[PDB]
Every structure is written in structure tokens, then in C-alpha cells.
Design a protein around this ligand. Structure first.
Ligand code: HEM
Ligand code: HEM
Ligand SMILES: [Fe+3]
Ligand SMILES: [Fe+3]
Ligand SMILES: [Fe+3]
Ligand SMILES: [Fe+3]
Ligand SMILES: [Fe+3]
Ligand SMILES: [Fe+3]
Lengths: 158, 154, 154, 153, 154, 158, 158
């Protein structure tokens, strides 16, 4: 069924954010694997897979709404030179995604697109309870355990 | 008996306070990512809930009215060492009361209540042993090492 | 914001009061030999604890401090129909407060909280329907037949 | 010797409880109350196991168990009467057991004391069960209670 | 018939006395360490209680009042040969009573109880044979050898 | 959990008694195995393991109460020359241990230290129902069966 | 088969050493469990049970040689205040028993007691390649990992 132009635009913005997040998490996971932080690499790989799943859901919604997805568009990438900076950059990007998701949910509610609102609410739940929560936990553990102990935990068994 | 029922009510008030404090501490431990310590605190919370269940059934056996309204002061810490020390503190301050209650139950020839409270005392003393051990481990291996062990699997 | 945290803490206090009320009612129900009704009440109490667990998770995630100290007034019933009426009434009041909290969360663009509270509302209205129909069952089949059903297998 | 005499009195009551519970269970099964009869059969069996443990304890103390004596059996003509008779016998059990436990604690004898303490735990559980059964009879009506005690037809 | 019910009550009293005697003898056999003889005495006790269950059900089905109050004189042996001799003598009395009761039940044309008592008499005669054989084995093989056999596994 | 000095002292005394019991049971089991009485050897190996477990419980209790568990101290041993002397010595020692345990239980109840009282009641129950009872049974069996029959039963399969 | 007084005497000395080691290992394992060092506690308990088995082997050999075992005598115990002193004392006692076992093996060879020599060589092999080796490894790990990291590994999963 035909969708609103505003709904399509906010969905395309969310898709651009999700694709950029997936690419950033991909590079971060690979640089963590390169550095030997196996458990961090596994977690960030799973998070990247979740990001691809969310992007797929967004593209399905966009096509269902008879819109054209903007997959060529990519946002700026903030790549960290070490694990604390990587965690901070991922957390900041996920926070911006959270704000954009909340704005899009409000727009969908105003535009009477309740199915899109349900999809975006599920995405916001995933971003807040799985992604943002884990990253904030990681920064807290970096500050509590210390960088050396946190990196020892991140490396895992060798 | 009136005195025995009042003492059991006070012990139950302790038990409910301990349940709430244990569960809150476990929840903020999970929030901070201390999965192993959070899991153990959740288990100790659940054990306290089972003990309070036993106590409420015992009070209803004695034709009394269990008091699930009163709660003691909750000692909530801002960090893991403060949680451990607060938990051990409440366990000790209530262990003394449990010992006095067991003495009273022995006085009044109430022996099933005495047996239940002796089991509660054994579990409580294991808990104090665990928490004193945790504080000494924090002293020995260090704060950061203990926090890393509390996190467990990243 | 502080308003959403205050609303969530109010809902959490409602949850803790419901937990205590359900557990007390189940304890007295099995004290009186109402095994089936007591089992159902104990299960509902467990579900209320799971809900309070989720609420404490959400409050901690929102950079807040859950209040596990404050508790509401416990409507302890003198018999089974009075327990049903008390539980139904407190569920009605909690449902009204929950609806207000959901509206406030939607107003503040707090959508994950709204989802959690909508789940809470679904479960709460399921309980409210259950207690309403149990009171109507006491009416329809009589008090003695309802007590016979509430006891279950001897 | 006082501990032995107290243990023999507890054993005499436990034998009387065995007999009363078994006869009540058999009467309930004769009347068709299968659930109540099964529960009373289980209670009699538990009291038989308790008497077995107490006879073991008495013989371990180099005493002579007095299986000849038996207390009066309170036999009821209808189900509520047998319920209250069981309850009264259990109340007498509880009083005698508490006196025995205090005596055992006084005599620095502790193993028979923990045996008597667990016995008192089951006895208080049974006391609660029978008081609850009487209150349930009052609550649901004798007809409904007998229907539940019948179980499956 | 009144005489049949009185005879059934007498046989029930004999069976209850046998139950008490057999269980006591099993318990002191286990106290002395005669594990195998104690196990056999325990099994014999259990069979006598099953027989008393059958007899009680028969008395009730005849619309009669079972007399579980009465009990005969317990012959308690100071040693294992005396235990076996006392068991055999009590079985002698029980068998004579059983034969008379079976004759009486046949006379009154009450055949179901006669068949139940025939089963009881078959088991009683088997018990006669076992205890007579045990005493003869004691005499043949020596008390020390018989006691070693009664111990079985140390 | 600082306990009373009297409780710690009597627990150390019980620990000394328990360790001496373990040593006596060890020697007796070894010489029964040497003589070919494998059934008795198995029973006394079990009993010596039980006494080691009891000593472990006592040491754990003394360490819980911030006390120093004395283990270097031993009591005089009573090694039996033959099986009846083994049984007599073990029975007498276990009865004396029972007397000490009863005194300790009374004292622990007096000092309101009920967890130690529960531990000591468990130890007294194990000593009375399992150890003292079996040794009394063995003495009675040696009396009734005679020495030769009892030793044949103890030998088992030759 | 008669055993010489010298062989039986050195076997009794070795048995005394094994029993004293068993008591010291008992106390050390119990205080390790007390302090929450679970991994070290399990290891030391296993080593103490190994010492019990060694003492049993020695007692059986002594009884074969028609000699009375010396089970009552105990050497002076050396209980460590903390883990490093604990394991330094354990290593010192193990080295002492290693020298004693070597002297006993030489004497057994000099006296044509080849089966006793075999048993003592098995005991020395176990002592050197299991007990001594692990203790030296533990001291090296205390030096290398540091005390805090080594105690973290000793505590294991809390
Ligand atoms: C006040 C806040 C409480 C919270 C947040 C809480 C939380 C929980 C949770 C999450 C569970 C596990 C449920 C599951 O695994 O499905 C549980 C179990 C249980 N709780 Fe609560 N609880 C609370 C209070 C109480 C109280 C006051 C009592 C009794 C007086 C109690 C008695 C029990 C019992 C008996 C169980 C079953 C445990 C088992 O059998 O394994 N709870 N509780
Ligand atoms: C007077 C002292 C008695 C003692 C010490 C005693 C003891 C026992 C014991 C130890 C059991 C074993 C239950 C189990 O292991 O499952 C048992 C079962 C039983 N008893 Fe008793 N009993 C006594 C009297 C009686 C009497 C008077 C009756 C009936 C008139 C009776 C009827 C039964 C029955 C039917 C069983 C079940 C048999 C089975 O499950 O195979 N008992 N008793
Ligand atoms: Fe996402
Ligand atoms: Fe580390
Ligand atoms: Fe009905
Ligand atoms: Fe023979
Ligand atoms: Fe012992
Ligand atoms: Fe060694």
C-alpha cells in the first residue's frame, strides 16, 4: 500500500543509519579480531549481523510502502584507533540512531502508520537493550576493571 | 505463642528486607555487567525468598498474621565493594537477632520453629562466610581483579 | 527525565505491593487447604515478581534508582471471596495508574518504556478479568461449590 | 532410664496412632471415600515408619520396647468424627513429644532428641492437616467435603 | 452372624499380636547384627500386616466392628533360638484358632471369609514349617553356625 | 564470625580426637587387610574415610570461627593385637569421643552458638548410629558366633 | 618374608613424613577453601588424598615385612600465613621427603629389598613429577603473574 513521503524519507534515513552502523561494526569487529580480542570480535560480529537484519527489515518495510530504498547513501564512519575509542564511537553512533528512531516513531504515530511504528519500536528496543546497553556496560567496565584487565577479558583464551 | 509469633514476625521482616536488598543489588550488578556476581546475588535472593516462604508458612501454622508490610532500611551501595559490605553487615546484624530468636524458641518449648530457624541460621552463616570471603578477596587480589572476576564472561 | 522515572517507580511500588499481597494470599490459601486456588495465586505472585524484575531493569537502564523500600497498603483478606475482592480492587487501581504511566511515557517519547508497560497492562488486565470472573463464579456456582473447586484434589 | 521410659511412652502413642489411622483408612475405604482413605493409609504408613525408627532408637539404647501396651483408640462413626479424633490424638502426641524433647535435652541425650524433633515436625504437620480438614468441612459443607473425599467414583 | 464376627475379631487379635512380635523380633535381630534373619522376620511381619489388612476389610464388609484395641501376650525371646521358639509357639496358637474359626465359618455357610481364612491358614502352616525347620537346623548345625548364617554378610 | 574461645578450644579437642580416630582406623584396617579379612578391611576403610570427613568438618568450623585448627596434637593410640582387641579398642575410643561430643554439644548450646551445635549433633549421630553401633554389633557377634566363625565371615572369599 | 630392622625403620620414617605431609596439606587445603581460593583448594585436597594413598602403600609394605608401622609420630608442621608462604612450606617439605626417599631407595638397593625399592621408586616418582613439580610451578607463577593475578587465578569462578 502507498505510504507517506515523510514516512518513506524517515525510513530511508533510518536505513542509511543502519547500513553505516553495520559497516562500522564490521570494520570494528575485524580490527578487534586482528588485535586478538576474540570475545569482543565475536560480540561485534553478532551485533553487525543484527544490524544487517534490521536494515533488511527496514528495506522490506520501504518496499512494502511502495518506496525506493536509498542503499547507496552512507554516513560518515567514526573508526577508533583502540578499543576504548571503538566502544565510545559505537556508543555515540547508536545514541544518534536512538534519537533518529524516536523521531521517526513520533512521525509514524502522527502519520497513522502503526505497522511501521511497530517495526521501528522493535528496532528501538533492539538498539536500546542490546546495543546501547552493552556498549555502556563496556565503557563502565573499562573504567572499573581498568584498560589492562578489560583487554585481558576481551582477548579471551589464547 | 505471642512472644514467639512476634519474634518470627521480626525475623520475617528481616527476610523481606534481605530479599529486596539482594534483588536490587543483583539488578544493579547486572546493569553494570557483573554477570557472575549478579547471578550469585540473584541466587542468594531466591534462597532468601524460599526461606521467607518457609517462615510465612510457619507463622500461619502458629495461627499468626505474617507481617509483609514492614521493611527494614535498605543498604544499597554505589559500588560492588559497598554492596558486599552492606550485604555482610545486614547479614551479621540479623544473625544476632536470629540467634536470640532461636534461644527464645528453645525457652518456649517450640522446637519445630527452632528447627526451621536453625536451618535459617545455617544458611545465613554460610552467607556471611561467603561475603567475608568476598571482602577479603577484594583486599587480596585487588579491586580491579575482583571486578574482572565478577564480570566473568565478557 | 525525572517524571518518567517517578512514574516507573510508582509502578514498581505497585508491583512490589502486588507481589507481597499475592504471596500472602497464596500462603493463607494453602494454610486453609485451598490447594488449587493457592497454587494459582502463587503462580500469579511469581509472575508479578518477574514483572517487577523487568521494571527494575528498565529503571536502572534509565539511570535511575529503583525504590524497593516503599510499599503500598496490603489488603489481606479474611476468607477466599474477600481475597478475590481485594486482589481485584488493587488490580483495578494499579491498572488505572499503569494507563496513566503509559500515557506519560508516550508523551515523553519514551517508547521502550511504553512497550514494557503495555506488556504489564496486558498481564494486569488478564489478572483483572480472572478475578472478576472468579467473583462471578462464586456468585454463579455458590460459595461452597467454589470452595470445593478451590481445594481441588484432596 | 527416664529417657527410655519416655521413649517407650512415645512408642506406645505411635502404635496407637498406627492402629487408629489404619482402622480409619479401612473404614473410609469401606464407605467409598477413596481419597481420604488413601491419605489416611499414607499417614498410617508414615507412623509405622516412625515407630520403626523409634524402636531402632530404643534398642540402640539397650532398652526393651513396650509393644504390648496401646492407648485408647478414638474410633469415629462418620468422617468428621474420625477427623476430629485424629486431631485430638495428634494434639496429645504433640504435648507428650514436647515434654519428651525437653527431657531428652535435659539428660544431655541428643540423638534421640533430633529423632523426636523430626517426629514432632511430622506430628505438627498432621495436626495442621486435620485442623484444616475440619475447617474445610465447615467451609464447603459436609456434602461437598464427602464428595471430594470420595474422589473418582 | 455374631459368632463369625467374634471369631474374625479373635483371629485379627492374633494377627496383630503376631505383627507386633514379628516386627520387634526383626528389630532386635537387626540390632544384634543378624541381617538375614532380621530381613526374613521383617518380611514375615509385613505379610502378617497384609493379612490383618485383608481381615479388617473382611470384618468391615460384614458390617462389623474390627477390634484393633486388643493384643495378646508378646513372647519376646532373649536370644535367636528363643525368638524362633516363641514365634513357632505363637504360630501354634494362631493355627489352632484358625482351624476352629474355619470350621465355624463353614458351619454358618459363610464361604468368602472361610476362603480368606484358608489363605491365612496356608500361610500360617508355611510359617510353622519354616520355624520348625529353623529350629531343627539350629540343632543339626550348631548355634554358632546358625548364627553365622543368620548374619550373612558381615 | 569470631566464636567463643571455649567453643574453639573444645572443637580443637574434638579435632584431635577425630584425627587420632582416623589414624587408629587406618592402622586397624591395614592390618585387617594384611591378615586377609577383606570384609572388615572394607568396612574400616569406609569408617576411616568417614572420620577424615568429620575432621574436615571440624577444621572448617574452627576456621570459620577465626580459630587456629590444631592438628599436630595426637592422643595415645590403642592398636589391637587381634580382631577382638581391634573391636574393643575402636569401641572404647568411639565411646569416649561420644562423651566428649556430648559435652561439646552442651557447651555450644550454652554459648548460643547453634550452627556448631548442629554440626556436633551431626557428628554425634554419625558416631553413634554408624560407628559405635557397628562396633557393638561386632563385639556381640564375636561373642555369639565364636571367634572362628566370625573370622571366617570377616575373611569372606578366600 | 622377614624385613630387616633398617629397611623397616626407614619405611617408618617415610610413613611419618607422609602422615605429617597429609596433615599439613589438610590444614592448607582447608584454609585455602576458607579464603575462597577454590582452585588451589581442590588441587591441595587431591594432593592430600595422594599423600594418604602413599601412606597406605607404606603401611602395607611395612606390614608385609612383619614390622609395626609408626603411625602416631608426627613431624613438626609448618603452616603458612598466606598462599606464598603456604606453598614455600609445601615445596620445602616435599624436597625434604625427596631426599629422605632417595636415601631410603639407596638403602633398599644396598639390602636386596628390590620390591620395597620398587615401591619407594614409585613414591619418589609421584613426589617429584606431581607434587614437587606443581609446587615449583606455583612459586614461579607467583613470581611471574604477580600475587594479585595469581590469587585471581586461585580464586577461580566466584
Ligand atoms: C519483592 C520483590 C521480589 C522480586 C523482584 C522477586 C523475584 C523473583 C524471581 C525473578 C523469581 C524467579 C521466577 C522464575 O524463575 O520464573 C522468584 C521466585 C520465587 N520467589 Fe520471589 N521476588 C520477590 C519477592 C518475594 C517474596 C517476598 C517472597 C516470599 C515471601 C518470594 C518467594 C518466591 C519463591 C518461593 C520463589 C520460587 C523459587 C523457586 O522455587 O525456585 N518472592 N522471585
Ligand atoms: C505395630 C507396629 C508396626 C510397625 C512398627 C510397622 C512398620 C511398618 C513398616 C516399616 C512398613 C514398611 C513401609 C514401606 O517401606 O513402604 C509397613 C508397611 C505396612 N504396614 Fe505396618 N507396622 C506396624 C503395624 C501395622 C498394622 C497393625 C497394620 C495393619 C493392621 C499394618 C499394615 C501395613 C501395611 C498394609 C503395610 C504395607 C505393606 C507393603 O507396602 O508391602 N502395619 N509397616
Ligand atoms: Fe539497529
Ligand atoms: Fe587480571
Ligand atoms: Fe459439589
Ligand atoms: Fe562355619
Ligand atoms: Fe567421629
Ligand atoms: Fe608424599
Amino acid at each position: 500500500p502507498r505510504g507517506s513521503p515523510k514516512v518513506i524519507s524517515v525510513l530511508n534515513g533510518l536505513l542509511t543509519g543502519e547500513l553505516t552502523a553495520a559497516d562500522q561494526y564490521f570494520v570494528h569487529a575485524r580490527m578487534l579480531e586482528n588485535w586478538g580480542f576474540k570475545v569482543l570480535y565475536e560480540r561485534i560480529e553478532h551485533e553487525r549481523h543484527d544490524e544487517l537484519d534490521h536494515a533488511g527489515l527496514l528495506i522490506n518495510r520501504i518496499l512494502f510502502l511502495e518506496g525506493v530504498p536509498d542503499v547507496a547513501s552512507r554516513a560518515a564512519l567514526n573508526i577508533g584507533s583502540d578499543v576504548p575509542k571503538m566502544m565510545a564511537n559505537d556508543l555515540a553512533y547508536e545514541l544518534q540512531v536512538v534519537d533518529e528512531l524516536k523521531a521517526a516513531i513520533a512521525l509514524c504515530e502522527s502519520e497513522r502508520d502503526y505497522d511501521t511504528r511497530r517495526i521501528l519500536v522493535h528496532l528501538l528496543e533492539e538498539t536500546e537493550q542490546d546495543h546501547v546497553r552493552w556498549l555502556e556496560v563496556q565503557v563502565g567496565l573499562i573504567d572499573k576493571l581498568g584498560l589492562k584487565n578489560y583487554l585481558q577479558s576481551a582477548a579471551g583464551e589464547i | 505463642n505471642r512472644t514467639v509469633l512476634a519474634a518470627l514476625n521480626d525475623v520475617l521482616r528481616h527476610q523481606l528486607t534481605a530479599i529486596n536488598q539482594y534483588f536490587l543489588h543483583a539488578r544493579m550488578m547486572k546493569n553494570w555487567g557483573f554477570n557472575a556476581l549478579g547471578k550469585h546475588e540473584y541466587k542468594e535472593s531466591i534462597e532468601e525468598m524460599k526461606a521467607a516462604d518457609k517462615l510465612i508458612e510457619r507463622i500461619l501454622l502458629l495461627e499468626g498474621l505474617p507481617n509483609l508490610q514492614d521493611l527494614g532500611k535498605l543498604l544499597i551501595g554505589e559500588n560492588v565493594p559497598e554492596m558486599l559490605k552492606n550485604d555482610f553487615a545486614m547479614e551479621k546484624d540479623a544473625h544476632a537477632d536470629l540467634v536470640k530468636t532461636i534461644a527464645l524458641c528453645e525457652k518456649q518449648a517450640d522446637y519445630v520453629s527452632r528447627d526451621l530457624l536453625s536451618e535459617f541460621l545455617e544458611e545465613c552463616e554460610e552467607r556471611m562466610d561467603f561475603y567475608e570471603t568476598q571482602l577479603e578477596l577484594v583486599k587480596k587480589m585487588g579491586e580491579q581483579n575482583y571486578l574482572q572476576s565478577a564480570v566473568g564472561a565478557l
